[PDB]
Each structure stands twice: as structure tokens, then as C-alpha cells.
Amino acid sequence: SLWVDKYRPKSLNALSHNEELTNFLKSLSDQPRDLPHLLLYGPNGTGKKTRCMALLESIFGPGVYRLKIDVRQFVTASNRKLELNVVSSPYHLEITPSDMGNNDRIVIQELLKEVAQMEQVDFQDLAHRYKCVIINEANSLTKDAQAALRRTMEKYSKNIRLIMVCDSMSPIIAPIKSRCLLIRCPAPSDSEISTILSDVVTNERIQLETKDILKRIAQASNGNLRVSLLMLESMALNNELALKSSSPIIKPDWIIVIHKLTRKIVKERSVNSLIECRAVLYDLLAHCIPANIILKELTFSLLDVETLNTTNKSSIIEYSSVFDERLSLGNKAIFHLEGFIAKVMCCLD
Amino acid sequence: QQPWVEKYRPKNLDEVTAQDHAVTVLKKTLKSANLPHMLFYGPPGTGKTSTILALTKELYGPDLMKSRILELNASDERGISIVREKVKNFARLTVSKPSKHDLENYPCPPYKIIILDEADSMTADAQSALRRTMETYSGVTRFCLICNYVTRIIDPLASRCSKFRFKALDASNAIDRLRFISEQENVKCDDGVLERILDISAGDLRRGITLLQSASKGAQYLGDGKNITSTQVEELAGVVPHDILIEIVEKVKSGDFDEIKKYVNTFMKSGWSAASVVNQLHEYYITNDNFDTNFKNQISWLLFTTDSRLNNGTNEHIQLLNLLVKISQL
Amino acid sequence: SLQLPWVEKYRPQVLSDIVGNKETIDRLQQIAKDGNMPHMIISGMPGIGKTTSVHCLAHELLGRSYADGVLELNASDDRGIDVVRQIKHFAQKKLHLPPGKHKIVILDEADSMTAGAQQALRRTMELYSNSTRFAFACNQSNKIIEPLQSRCAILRYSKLSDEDVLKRLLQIIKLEDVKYTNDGLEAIIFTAEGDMRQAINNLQSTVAGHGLVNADNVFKIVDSPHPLIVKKMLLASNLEDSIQILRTDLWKKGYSSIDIVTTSFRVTKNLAQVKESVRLEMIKEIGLTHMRILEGVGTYLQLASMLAKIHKLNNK
Amino acid sequence: NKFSASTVHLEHITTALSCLTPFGSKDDVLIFIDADGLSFVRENNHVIKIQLLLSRELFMSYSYRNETEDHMKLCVKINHILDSVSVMNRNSDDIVECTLSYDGHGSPFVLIFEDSFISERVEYSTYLIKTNGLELDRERISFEAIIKGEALHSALKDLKEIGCKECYVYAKTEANDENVFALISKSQLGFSKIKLPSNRSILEKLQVFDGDSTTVIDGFAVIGFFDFTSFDKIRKSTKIASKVLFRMDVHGVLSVNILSQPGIVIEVCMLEKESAQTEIELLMET
Amino acid sequence: SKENLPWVEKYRPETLDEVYGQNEVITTVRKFVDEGKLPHLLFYGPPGTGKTSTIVALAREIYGKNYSNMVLELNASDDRGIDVVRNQIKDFASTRQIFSKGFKLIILDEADAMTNAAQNALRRVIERYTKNTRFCVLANYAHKLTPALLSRCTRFRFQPLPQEAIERRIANVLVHEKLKLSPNAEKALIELSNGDMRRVLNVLQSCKATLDNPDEDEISDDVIYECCGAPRPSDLKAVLKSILEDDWGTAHYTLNKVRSAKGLALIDLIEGIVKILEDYELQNEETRVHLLTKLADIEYSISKGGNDQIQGSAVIGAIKASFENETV
Ligand SMILES: Nc1ncnc2c1ncn2[C@@H]1O[C@H](COP(=O)(O)OP(=O)(O)OP(O)(O)=S)[C@@H](O)[C@H]1O
Ligand SMILES: Nc1ncnc2c1ncn2[C@@H]1O[C@H](COP(=O)(O)OP(=O)(O)OP(O)(O)=S)[C@@H](O)[C@H]1O
Ligand SMILES: Nc1ncnc2c1ncn2[C@@H]1O[C@H](COP(=O)(O)OP(=O)(O)OP(O)(O)=S)[C@@H](O)[C@H]1O
Ligand SMILES: Nc1ncnc2c1ncn2[C@@H]1O[C@H](COP(=O)(O)OP(=O)(O)O)[C@@H](O)[C@H]1O
Ligand SMILES: [Mg+2]
Ligand SMILES: [Mg+2]
Ligand SMILES: [Mg+2]
């Protein structure tokens, strides 16, 4: 398996990148009977899902990591048969309503309502009494599945509990946030990522030459542990079980494509350059990369150019904010992704 | 047992704090039988659902409720078809005969109540198909609409429904309830606490009771028998520490775009919410006396625009960086 | 309980009593006498005589066989492809008509028909063109498919002028011996806006309410067309007067904000003496206000803000 | 229990329910409870109304202990009753004793099915009441015809098979025993006519009056223009009719009276269209 | 019976005498009824102005005991698709009225919610059976009705209720409930209604419930403002004066104190300030534009929620900004 999964912490005592948060999780799990609904928010890849699974182990004992997949099908308002993968555990449940699209409403109103209606009592029943359902990517719920959750998890909370993992809580409506306990998961420092990578290379044979390259991995990952371990394995496979200080820090292909787009924008500012930028943006979108991420990375690559003055960067960030707001309240992403670029190269000239 | 929010839910109308302008009217309804159609609107976690459930319990009782109450929320389909058949049929139903126990213990008004919670999520056609359903069967059926944004309720429906605004629960009107919960849950706190909880929870008692529950859980876990301090509740809420805010504003005072860019980049890794930091910046910049009128006039609009953009579900790194850059160039 | 409304009581029964479209009406009378009436599509706006002319044409043409000759179908009747497959037996029917006369199939409101029905109507119009003729009457000619318009002679009815409205009003008045004055009839025509039916209805209402058709009595029960008040509001010089109109003549009169926004959109589309950039900016502002109104904020402050933005983009 | 009725001849109430189906199949039904018997009333679009009546003699027990009011009115949906009795008639060959019950306003309509081993009990929810204005004037009858059930049922079936978008009725009795009664239809075939015979076994009595039900005259005919959508609502009731009585007044109301063999009495009131008259006369003089 | 009904439904007019405010239309329809000819009517106006009441009372003075067999009332609570128009309305219109009260009446309440296909099909039912039936159309939004339908219907506009009509009806309600209302309370009620009878009746019912002794106890303006939760005029004037003259900190403190004194919301304060601003004698004409634009944006944002403390500061900043161009 991958080094992100093979070395995944499988308990609350195995966490080693945030201790205040681990103490808080232990405090929550000491008395599991009055556990409220929890909303874990923080940067991507900090270990929010790992912390949730550790908490579920701590509350329901070992038994929560034995996942198996259930195929569950619905039908939209019209006769549109739909499928959703449901990975389930003897003590908890996990679904990703965002994977089905704008029709997560039927999923929330049928699957979750059915599980919340069942009492789970087994001959006069914390452990296999209430149920825990994990909503992965709670940000992508389309402002309506969050409305169907306001009463589902407030009326049937005696036999079900909700713990949702979301990076950021801007797209989550106020009523949903009000009913839940907010748990913040800060990103680990570079020293902690270096320590984790050192442990991995100690249990592995990557044959490090200097422990200042693990620091380079940590700095290049921008606080993302999954990405850090992915680069570690990448270099420790392309460069053999050997990591020299000359080894190349591997970055995702879409990132370097966005950097090339940035350099093209800075160099060439003309209508034909705009059309080629559109072609590259279409190629990026053809890989199912979300448009907000494309805009964010493009903006933060444009702000990294050393040949731009402060006024150009301020204009770039203002246009980025305006077009991010437009993208949020929009249907087609290409219009806004093109408008941002057009304004950028109309300002740099 | 159960979360303190689902354990201290008001059971009668006398447990509903801070809303007397509406609870008094609903209590006067008990002796009479002229309950009008009600439109409950207000900020989240203000007690609308609790108030209506308490009123229903006091009017009917556990036995007659199952026959004289219909509750429809956003968790179930409420399209035009459902509105035109199911709600209409329930409104057309005859009032069930109350039992002798019910008549001798409860007022048992000669009508039923249809509770449409989260009515703001209903479409305009569904709300239009309600007007004559309420008007024609007003004498045998009553309607209660619960919503957070009154603008999402169409004007014709808002005209026929009596409007009851539920006030925001601040530290001046909900301190007694939180104190009661604390003394009944044996929660020890310093002076100033249980007021900072209500200040952080802007007009929301549900969150001001969940925060207190989490603080008590942690305090019981640590096991030193010491009170809960303001720092602990603040940290648990998600409030940015004052030192980080001071560093942010010093970087803003500097003006350098790349310094601000890197501080924001390292700040977004901490996971702090953009809304909370924006609110703290608002408090700092408006209540200070070191800034001129023009500075405050411009920054109020800047913070307003940033908050409006954040409420729409946008990237917080782009919005926070833009707000700080703008504040650095005023 | 025995009187019929003046709209139906005075509906013309002969082609000579149909005011307006002088040339078109003369052509229709010539077709009535000569015969050999072609397939026709009669378009135009409401209240001009598109159905009072097709029915009169069918009457004066078929005459005594107006019962076995005129198959009238309209939106109130089912007109699916199945019906078009009632329209086939009627066409196949043989009736001994005078020379030059043909059966008429009056499909009133042909713009609301389904496209399958039209694709079958083409078959019927192609196989049975020598015995029966089709007279489509609609409000927008584009709703009839091009293959059907190809086989038909398009006759477009223009808006009725003030003189053809005044002449018919004078006829109806002389028949109803009501009292009037010149200003009252001018106001009735002004509020009619090229509609004969609306003019008749307004005259009937004024006579019933008061009896004397003067300006005051007409205007106290019939309101001046609000599209014109919207146009007056949008062309104001300073914002004071524009907001003043918006309030007094549109808000306190009971008009809904959404109605004002839609009327403003149409007025801007048809506005004159305004630059294209200004027109498109006003269209954008009106669209934003429409969005705000549809989302729930149906307040007078939104309309005031829209007028302020329009003035701001006008003065610069 | 303010009302209680027991019977074992469930086929009678089954035919009563199947005679109420033509008047829409998912809507409200009015049930009038009085000392004389049990009556179901249905109305459609304010243009046609049916009124079946189950007499006290059809039940061994019929209490009606209600004293405050002489008659009791309740409104229950018909789809619920149909869907229930449909699955209850699965084992109808068993000796079932139906028991109707009603405890007053606010109480459900009970329908107990006991087989001496299983006692199924159903409580139908009663709805608010929105049906007499649709009644012919008894002093204004223009024609009164008594027709046999089988002949009328056959004529209605034929008119259904011909389509019969619109229908016409004729009632002329000439100087001699020339009782003419016909059912003309405006159908795809064109102008079709079904003429009832003048013999006394099919047409027992035809009498045409001058709108007063007292003065009989010959040589004049009363014409009724009816929509066959409403006219087909009596076909399912004529299927079990021994004799059918037709009455119409000058206000344009046709009152079909159906008697079954004691059995069940069915009263249907039908409204006349606005309105071909000369075509009718010319076709029947021909 | 009629004593356990809401005041909005208990005080529904039964005859055209009791419909106030709308005088011209009532006079015209009374003359139409007496003359015996009734055209196809269309009633237009704001909600709660008395359209349904007017048409129902007219159809009770036109029919009587047969108001249930001569009038077919269809509204938004009923399906009104193409099939409904083609079958139910067509069969009601074609049939005869048993000669009762001449023509039959069809009332289409809330016709603005009807689909365009149904309205287009109704055109040839309105003008074919006009000899037997008369159609009435009730709508609040005229843009949702086809122009052809508007052409064949006589348009009567129901204006917002004037002050005099509200005063008369409030007096009727008071006498029928044995209540006392001060002149200032009546002013406040008639002003908060915005030409709505239903709002008046609901607020009066809440006022009666608020009073300890519904009889012997008067409804002052304070009671009205407490029950309806609206700012007092003095509160709005004080907030505005603090914003205009005092500094930023004092203005912020005064706004917060005013809102916390009685739990006042921000949207009602915004509206109250907006009216006073509308009255002002501005001399720059960009003050007005900035005020309207900024306050409309703030109101829309409030309509979608957010930080209620950021929005108050936004309001203060918008006012100060706009009223700095006045001195320019
Ligand atoms: N006035 C009050 N007195 C006591 N508890 C209250 C009050 N208002 C709210 N609460 C508490 O707030 C929690 C939730 O209140 P609810 O009224 O059910 O939520 P809400 O008002 O419907 O907000 P929504 O559903 O998001 S619109 C419960 O634990 C209540 O005990
Ligand atoms: N040219 C005309 N001269 C006199 N009266 C007319 C004329 N056109 C229409 N009318 C009157 O309008 C009414 C009949 O309306 P129509 O002519 O059928 O309207 P229309 O042109 O068919 O518009 P649509 O398509 O039905 S909305 C009667 O009251 C007529 O007297
Ligand atoms: N002119 C009036 N005089 C007295 N009471 C009135 C008047 N207008 C309205 N009301 C009251 O307000 C209630 C609602 O008015 P309605 O006439 O039923 O509805 P409406 O005015 O047609 O508004 P919509 O468009 O139907 S929401 C009535 O039941 C009356 O109690
Ligand atoms: N405390 C930890 N110790 C070691 N590895 C960790 C720790 N926390 C997270 N990780 C690593 O990070 C990877 C991804 O974490 P993940 O659960 O995806 O975070 P998020 O839920 O925020 O995306 C896991 O494969 C895990 O190995
Ligand atoms: Mg609620
Ligand atoms: Mg026409
Ligand atoms: Mg109404």
C-alpha cells in the first residue's frame, strides 16, 4: 500500500502532530454518551479524517477500520436512477454526497433519514447505541442538502451523530454550524512533518543523505502531509531507495502547467495569448480539477513573480477576489477563469 | 444522556427566555381559541422551534398531538404537488374528538396546527398554493411558518401570517438561562465567563450551550477542580488570539505586499476561520480612537464587502489577503 | 341579466364594419366575393380584428353552408396530432359548394399548437388543398413552423390608429345613445393604446359608473398606461423627479415592484434618443434589480437604488 | 354509537360503490345518515350529481340513536374506501357481516368485516363538507319516459362504441300511440340515431307536457342537448337497472331514476348544455 | 363559531358596504350589478386590499342562496392546468344555469400563478360562453398574465387602503372587541400597515393579547412598538443624529445601545432611516445616489444574513461618506 495508508495512525494515542487537539479529542471521547455533532475544519491533508477515525476507534473500540463498500441507489425528482458508494463500518457510516452532484438532496433525505429513524436498540441497548455518520467534503453540499440536515440531526440525534470533515466553513450555512461543535485542525509545522518523514524513512530504506531534504519536502508541501509522503515515496522510488540533496522535489503536473500559464501571461499579453491561455485552461478543466483551485493557484503563482510591482499584485488579488465571488455564484467556470486572465494581462501592460 | 441543547430544550412556554413579546401572546391564546396564523422569523438558535413545540404540547398534550399536529420541514419533500394534496387534505380534515382526560386537563382548542418549519426553502409556487388553503380552512386549521430569512417568504403569505420576530439572544437577556444550565450541570467558571460565551455566540444560545458543554467536558477531563477561564472558551470557539491579531495589523501597517502575502499564507495554515478574524479586525478598527473618520468610513465598507463575499462561499485565502492588502493601502 | 357586454353585443358581423387595416379589409372583401380564398395566416396584436375578420370572411364566403363548411378549432379545444389526424375527415368530406367556394378550417390561436400537429397539418394541407382551405389566426407568426408559412399567404394586421378607434366608438355610442365629450373620448383612445376591445370595455365601464364620458370620469376608473409612466420615470433629468414618479405614480398606486422592473426592461428595449452604451448599462442595472426582486427583496429601496444607478450612468 | 348498521348481503353495498365510481374515482363522497336509510351523494364539476340510497330494510340492525339532529352528514374520500374494500373482497366468498358505524362529528367512519374468525376494522377519516341545487323542478316537467334497463344500457354501450362526443334526446308523442324516444349522437360516424321502440315492454310510458307536468299535448318535441361525458355516468347504474325513469323540465335538468331489484334506488341529475336543432327535427322527420 | 377565528378572517366583509377604501371600483361594480350586465372583470392590486372580499360579496349580491351553484371558484390551491381549463371550466360554462340569477360566474383567484397554456386556452372560453358566464380574474402581479387575457378583461385597480378607511375599520374592530386605542397608537398602526388591512388586524389582535386587562386597558404606541418589535420614532431620530453629528465611536455606541434597549433589528432601523433620508433637502444629488446604492446593498446582504455587527458599521460608514459630499 501507499506510505500515506501503510503508516496511517490507527488510534488516538498514535497522533503526533497536534497535542492540544489530541487532548481535546480524548476529552470528547472520555464520555461518549453525550457527544455532540462535530465539524472538523482545517487545511487539506492535516489528518482530519485520521483524527475522526481515531476518535471513532476510541468511542466504539477497535472495529471501525474494517470498511466494506455498499452500493446504494436512488432516483431523482424525475425518473433518473442514481448510484452512490456507501463505505460502512459495523459502528459508523461514511458517505460522500458531493460525488452524486446537485442531487445530494435525495441522498440526504432518504439514506440519512432512514438511518436516523432506526433506533438501533438491540434488546434494551456510546457503543453500538447511537450511530456516527461521516460526511466527507461537507463544503460541496449545494445549500439545500444542508437544509435537510437541520432537522435530521436535531430530532433523531438520540440514535445518530454526525461528524463531518470539511476544508473551510465558508460554504456551510449558519444553521448547520450552529448545531455542531467546531473543531479546528491546524496544519503541522515543518518540524513535525520532518519528524514524521524521519520515522517513515527509519521504518523504510530510502537511505537519506541529509535530513535537510525532508525539510525541503515539508516546505514544498505547504503543510500537506499526504502530499509530503507522496513526494517522499515519489523521490524514494524515482531516485531509488536513495534521497540525495540533488534529488528533484517533484510537484504535480497541473501545478507546473499553471506555472507555465503564469509565465506565458507575464511574457505575452495579447489576444492570441489569451486564446492559448483559454486552451490550457480547458485542458486543465478536462482533468476534473475544480475551477476555484485553478484560480487560487494561478493567483498565487502570479503573486510570486518578482518582476511585478506592488500595484500590479494588488490589482491581481482584487481581480482574483472578484472573479472568485463570480465563480461561486455561477454555472460555467470558463467565463470567469477567462475574465480573470483577461483583466490580469490588461493590467500588467 | 443527551447533548445539553437537546436536554435543556424548553418544555413549556415559561422556559423560553428573552422572547416575551411573542410568548405572552401565545400564552394568552391558551385561554382563548383565536390563535392566528404565525410567522416565526429570527436569527438561528433563538428559540422558534422550541417555542412552537412548547405551545403545541401545552395546547394539546402528548395524546392529542399525534392527531392534531402536522409538521413538515426541509427534510421531506414539499413541492407543489405535496402542498396541493397532503397539506390541503390535512387542512380539510375534521377536528378529532378529544378524550375526557384531554378535555379535563388540556384546553384542546377546536383546530389543528400545521407547522411548516424551514419555510424559506420552499419554492414560490408552493407558497402561492398555500394562500387559499390557509384562508378557506382558517376556522378548522392553523398554520405556523418558521424561517430565518423573512424575505424568502412571499408577500401574500407574509400578509396572512402574524409576524413574530425572535430577538437575538445576547449576554443581557440570556445570561440567566446559561447560568441556570451551569448551576444545574455543576460547571465552575470565573467571573466574566458565561458572558464571553454569549459574546462569542452572537445571538445564538444553541452555540453558547454547546460551547459550555465542550468546556465542561474538557475541564472534567483535565481533573484539577479549577474553574473554566475565558481563554479556554475563546480557544474552543475558534477566536484568534490577540497576539496573532496584533501581528496581522502590524504587518498591515507596514504596507509591504509580499510580507502580508507570506503572513497570510502562514496564517491560513493554522486553520483560523476567515469570518472570525474579519469580525475581530472589525472590532479593533472601529472601536479604536487612533484612526480618523475617513479611515473608518472606508474600512467599514471594505469589511462589509469582504463579509458579503465570504458569506457566498468563496476562497478565504483570496478574500483575507485582498482585505488586508486593501487595509494596507488606505 | 339579459344584456350582453358591448364587446360581444357590437362584434362586427360583416367585413364592412371592421375598422382599420383598410387595405387588408378591402382585400378580404374581394376574396369574399371573387372566391378562391388562399391559405392565409393572420397575425397582429390583440384587439385588432384577426378573428372578427376570419369569421366574417367565412360567413360571407360559405354563407348557407357555414355549418358544414367552417371547422373551427381553437386553444380551448384539444388540437393534438390525434385531432389533426377531425381535420382529416372534414377535409375528405365532399360538399356541393357554389363555384369558387371552398371549405374553411379556422384554426384560431394556431401559435399554441404542438409541432406534431403542425407537421401533420402540412400533410392535410398538401393532400386536400383543392377542396378545403386553412385560415390560421395568431398573435406571433413565428410560432407557426416555416413549412406551414410557406404554403400560406401572410397578412399582417397593424395596430389600429386613433381614427379607426374613434370611428367605431362613435358608432357604438350612437347605437347606445350615451353622453360624451371630446376630451373623454380622447382619453378613452389614449388609454386603449390601439386596442378596440379595451376601448369598448373602458367606455362601457365609464358609462356604467357615471354615464358622462369626460376626462375626469374616464381617468378616475381607468388608469393611464403604466408603460408610459415607466418611460416618463426613466427619462427624467434629475433623480428627484424620477424617484418622485416611482413613488407617487407607481408605488402608492399599487403596482408591484416586479411589474415595474419588467415594464422598465421593455421600455429600455424600445427607448429612443439614448446611446447604445447607455441603453445596455440600463439593461444591466434593470437585470440586477430584477435578480434582487426575484430573490425576495421586493422593496422600494431597491427600485430607488436602480433609478439612482440609471441617473448616475446617464449624467456621465 | 350514534349510528350502526349490519348486513351480510355485501354484494348490495359493493354494487352501490361500483355505481359511485363513474362520478370520478379519487374525490370526496358525501354520506347522509337519517332514520330512513343510508345515502351516498356525489357531485362532479357542479354539472351532474348522483344520489344512491340504501334503505333501512337492507340492514337487520339500524339503530340511529342520534337525537340532537335528524340527519347526519359526513365527507370521506372514495379512493380510500375503494382501495380498502378492493383487498377486503379477496376472500368475499366467506360469510362476511359488514358493520357500518359513526359516532358523530369528529369521529371516523368505521367499517368492520367479521368472518367469525377475523374482525377487520377500518376507520375512515372524515373531512370538512364543502349538493341539492341540482334538482329538477317537480312542477315543470316537459317529458316523462319510463324505459327498460337493458335497452338503455345497450343504447349507452352503443353510443360509447360510436364515440359520441355529444348527445341528443327526443321526446315526442303524436296524436296516436306514436311515442317517439331517440338518443341522437354527434360522433365520428356523423349524425347517428338510436330510436327506442314504441312498444310497451321497452318504453312503458312516454308523456310530453307544456312545462307544467299536467297538460299533455301531441306533435311537439322536447330537445335535450347533453354532454356524453356526463351522460355516460349512468351506464354503470343502468347495468343493474330493471326500469329507468327519465324526467326533464324546461330549465334543462335531466333526472334519471334507476330502481334495482329492495335492491338500491339511484337518482342522477344532469344539466343541459347551452346549444343543430333543425338538423335534429329534419333527421327524425326523415 | 366566529369568535374563535383570527381577526383577519373574523372581520372579512360580507357585503359591499363593508369594503372600505376602494370607492370607485365598488360604485362601478354596484352599478354594473344593478344594470344587470357584468363584464369580465380583472382585479389588480397589492395583497390584502380587498379583492377576494369584493368579488365574493358581489357574487353574494348577484346570486344569494345559490352562490354555491352559480359561482365556480378556482385558486392556486387547486390544479389549473390545460386539462382543468379544457374540462372543468368548459363544462361549467357550457351547461345551463337553471335560469337562476341569469349568467353563471367563474372566479379565478391568484391567476398570476396559472401557466401560460391555461391562460391561452381560457381566451376562447371567456369570449365564447360570455352569453352564459362571466369570468373574474384576481391577481397581484400583472406581468404573469398573457396580454390577450388582459385585453378581454376589464381592469379595476385596487389601490392601497387610504388612512381614512383604515381608521373607520379600526373603529369597527375596536367597538366589536371593546378596545381603546390612543390617537398616537392609531397613527403608528396605520403607518406600520403600509396600506394593508390584514397587518392592521393582526397587530391589533397582538395588542389585545399584550394588554393585561383587554378591557379597561388601552393600547398605547409603546404597546404597539413592543408587540410588533419596531423602533420608536425617537429611536430612529436619535440614531440618525448620532451618526450625523457625533464621532465614529459615539455613533457606534449609541446605535448598539439603541438596538440592545429593546432588541431592535437592523433592517427596521435601516428602513426608518431611509424614510427620513428620503425626506431630506439634499443639494449635491450624489448624496442621494450613494445613499440609495449603498443602503440597498446593505439591505440585500442583510436579507442573506452575515455579521450583524459589520453591517451596522457599514451603514454608519455609508451615511457619513454620502453626507461628506453634501459639504464637498
Ligand atoms: N429562549 C430560549 N430559552 C431557552 N433555550 C433556548 C432559547 N432559544 C433557544 N434555546 C435553545 O436553543 C437550542 C435550539 O433552539 P431551537 O429553537 O430548536 O432552534 P431554532 O430557533 O429553530 O434555530 P433554527 O432551527 O436554526 S431557525 C435548544 O437547545 C434550546 O434549548
Ligand atoms: N377592426 C375592428 N373594428 C371594430 N371592432 C373591432 C375590430 N377589431 C376588434 N374589434 C372589437 O374587438 C372585439 C373582438 O375582438 P377580436 O377582433 O376577436 O380580437 P382579436 O384581434 O382576435 O385579438 P385576439 O387574438 O383574440 S387577443 C369586439 O368587441 C369587436 O367589436
Ligand atoms: N376594504 C376592506 N375592508 C375591510 N376589510 C378588508 C378590506 N380589504 C381587506 N380586508 C381584510 O383583509 C382580509 C384579506 O383580504 P382579502 O380581500 O381576503 O385578500 P386580498 O385583499 O384579495 O389580497 P390577496 O391578493 O388575495 S393576498 C379580509 O378577509 C378582510 O378581513
Ligand atoms: N499524526 C499523524 N501521524 C502520521 N501521519 C499522519 C498524521 N496525521 C495525518 N497523517 C497522514 O496524513 C495523511 C492524510 O490525512 P487525511 O486524513 O487525508 O487529512 P484530511 O482529512 O485533512 O485530508 C494520512 O495518510 C496520514 O498518514
Ligand atoms: Mg428550528
Ligand atoms: Mg382571436
Ligand atoms: Mg385573495
mmCIF file of C-alpha atoms and ligand atoms in Angstrom, chain A residues 150-151 154 179, chain B residues 49 117-118, ligand 5:
data_model
loop_
_atom_site.group_PDB
_atom_site.id
_atom_site.type_symbol
_atom_site.label_atom_id
_atom_site.label_comp_id
_atom_site.label_asym_id
_atom_site.label_seq_id
_atom_site.Cartn_x
_atom_site.Cartn_y
_atom_site.Cartn_z
ATOM 1 C CA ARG A 150 -31.032 20.842 10.119
ATOM 2 C CA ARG A 151 -33.895 18.675 11.398
ATOM 3 C CA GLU A 154 -31.617 17.626 15.651
ATOM 4 C CA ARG A 179 -25.968 22.902 15.794
ATOM 5 C CA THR B 49 -38.875 25.677 17.146
ATOM 6 C CA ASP B 117 -40.513 24.627 9.593
ATOM 7 C CA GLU B 118 -37.746 25.960 7.354
HETATM 8 MG MG MG F 5 -35.527 25.268 14.171
#
